[PDB]
Amino acid sequence: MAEDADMRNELEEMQRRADQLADESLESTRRMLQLVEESK
Amino acid sequence: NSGLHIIIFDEIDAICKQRGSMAGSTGVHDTVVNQLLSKIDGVEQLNNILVIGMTNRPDLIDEALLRPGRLEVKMEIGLPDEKGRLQILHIHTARMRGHQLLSADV
């Protein structure tokens, strides 16, 4: 019979999710809370 | 008033081929030719380029890429004759004869 030679492939990526800024925001906010508590 | 820009392709029949002849390329081998054609001679005008191509299978290349205006000067580089051989043998032994490293018999 006729056996297919094989195949070849193509690719199409997608955006990544770093989600790393929120960590810096959370650290900053905790510092906010610490200073706010001390001031009182 | 701009200068000349030279682009030296090589084995130009590895990417450029008759459109529709090849199958199973996933399409990447049929838009490259379109891009190249549209870029060499398009709606905008370019007047400061020079494209050189060299290949061993002249007849496989696309027909739409060889009309005058894109690749005009076509040349064949064939084997030499007796005078050609006498010339070619006289370029590669120039240094030896210079410093007397070549005997007087040859």
Curated annotation (Swiss-Prot), chain A:
Cite the record's Basic and acidic residues compositional bias ranges: 1-20
The known PTMs are summarized as: Palmitoylated.
Q: Which domain of life is it from?
A: Eukaryota
Region Disordered: start-end pairs: 1-23
Q: Where in the cell is it found?
A: Cytoplasm, Perinuclear region; Cell membrane; Synapse, Synaptosome; Photoreceptor inner segment
Job description of the protein:
t-SNARE involved in the molecular regulation of neurotransmitter release. May play an important role in the synaptic function of specific neuronal systems. Associates with proteins involved in vesicle docking and membrane fusion. Regulates plasma membrane recycling through its interaction with CENPF. Modulates the gating characteristics of the delayed rectifier voltage-dependent potassium channel KCNB1 in pancreatic beta cells.
Q: Quaternary structure per UniProt?
A: Part of the SNARE core complex containing SNAP25, VAMP2 and STX1A;this complex constitutes the basic catalytic machinery of the complex neurotransmitter release apparatus. Recruited to the SNARE complex following binding of the SNARE complex component STX1A to STXBP1. This complex binds CPLX1. Found in a complex containing SYT1, SV2B and syntaxin-1. Found in a ternary complex with STX1A and VAMP8. Interacts with HSC70 and with SYT9, forming a complex with DNAJC5. The interaction with SYT9 is inhibited in presence of calcium. Isoform 1 and isoform 2 interact with BLOC1S6. Interacts with CENPF.
Q: Which family does it belong to?
A: Belongs to the SNAP-25 family.
Q: What is this protein called?
A: Synaptosomal-associated protein 25
Which organism is the protein's source? Rattus norvegicus (Rat)
Curated annotation (Swiss-Prot), chain B:
User: What is the annotated localization of this protein?
Assistant: Cytoplasm
> What's its job?
Required for vesicle-mediated transport. Catalyzes the fusion of transport vesicles within the Golgi cisternae. Is also required for transport from the endoplasmic reticulum to the Golgi stack. Seems to function as a fusion protein required for the delivery of cargo proteins to all compartments of the Golgi stack independent of vesicle origin. Interaction with AMPAR subunit GRIA2 leads to influence GRIA2 membrane cycling.
Q: Could you say which protein family the record assigns here?
A: Belongs to the AAA ATPase family.
Subunit (UniProt)? Homohexamer. Interacts with GABARAP and GABARAPL2. Interacts with GRIA2. Interacts with PLK2, leading to disrupt the interaction with GRIA2. Interacts with MUSK; may regulate MUSK endocytosis and activity. Interacts with CDK16.
Q: What is this protein called?
A: Vesicle-fusing ATPase
Its taxonomic path starts at: Eukaryota, Metazoa, Chordata, Craniata, Vertebrata
Complete protein: which residues are present?
Answer: 319 to 424 of 744
